[PDB]
Ligand binder design. Structure first.
Ligand SMILES: N[C@@H](CCC(=O)N[C@@H](CS)C(=O)NCC(=O)O)C(=O)O
Length: 212
């Protein structure tokens, strides 16, 4: 208790938060929101955006996943999910901001069909190549030898992108073209903190298919 999380079951934005709380050992009450029938609590706690997720700590709300993650890191500092050095912290924030570009590429892919899909797939691959070569490099995690907030932010490139790829019949994140990023996503997907806190594959595929 004392910590509440208003979430949406299939959303990586919500999953990210769960992962961070679990890595911090913070107990939370999870509240599932029906996005088509938003609770009064949700509208009250996030009047600007009226979206999930929303973390409430001591009756005070924090909205926007990226902001919530930073708040969790600063509020429960043990087991740091950001490094100490300002330059390395800036590189973490830089690659989290590149997540904006990645989300856009993922969106185009998710929405494409025909020639559009082919183009989107290609642009997503190019987006991920930059992330792999210049962000991840030869490190096991974006955080080096353990996960940091960048790993959390990109974790959806495993289970979630995999479900979208199955839905579209097109794989973008594949070992032959992105061997380091594919290995990273597979290793993250096998970590208990991730594996225990994502939806079952069938449910995840069923959701993204329906949405399409
Ligand atoms: N920028 C937000 C994005 C989260 C988001 O888009 N949430 C969606 C669900 S995945 C939502 O709640 N949409 C509200 C609606 O359908 O009106 C964040 O990172 O937290």
């Amino acid at each position: 208790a004392e910590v509440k999380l208003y979430g949406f079951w299939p959303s990586p934005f919500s999953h990210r938060i769960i992962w961070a709380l679990k890595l911090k050992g913070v107990e939370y009450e999870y509240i599932e929101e029906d996005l088509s029938n938003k609770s009064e609590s949700l509208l009250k706690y996030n009047p600007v955006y009226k979206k999930t997720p929303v973390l409430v700590h001591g009756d005070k709300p924090i909205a926007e996943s990226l902001v919530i993650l930073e708040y969790i890191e600063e509020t429960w500092p043990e087991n740091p999910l950001l490094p100490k050095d300002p330059y390395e912290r800036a590189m973490a924030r830089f690659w989290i901001q590149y997540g904006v570009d990645t989300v856009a590429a993922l969106r185009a892919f998710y929405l494409g069909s025909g020639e559009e899909l082919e183009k989107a797939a290609k642009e997503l691959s190019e987006c991920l190549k930059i992330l792999e070569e210049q962000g991840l490099g030869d490190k096991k995690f974006f955080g080096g030898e353990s996960m940091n907030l960048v790993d959390i932010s990109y974790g959806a490139l495993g289970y979630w992108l995999a479900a979208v790829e199955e839905a579209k019949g097109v794989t973008v994140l594949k070992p032959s073209t992105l061997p380091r990023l594919h290995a990273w996503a597979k290793n993250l997907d096998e970590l208990p903190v991730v594996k225990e806190n994502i939806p079952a594959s069938d449910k995840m595929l069923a959701y993204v298919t329906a949405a399409m």
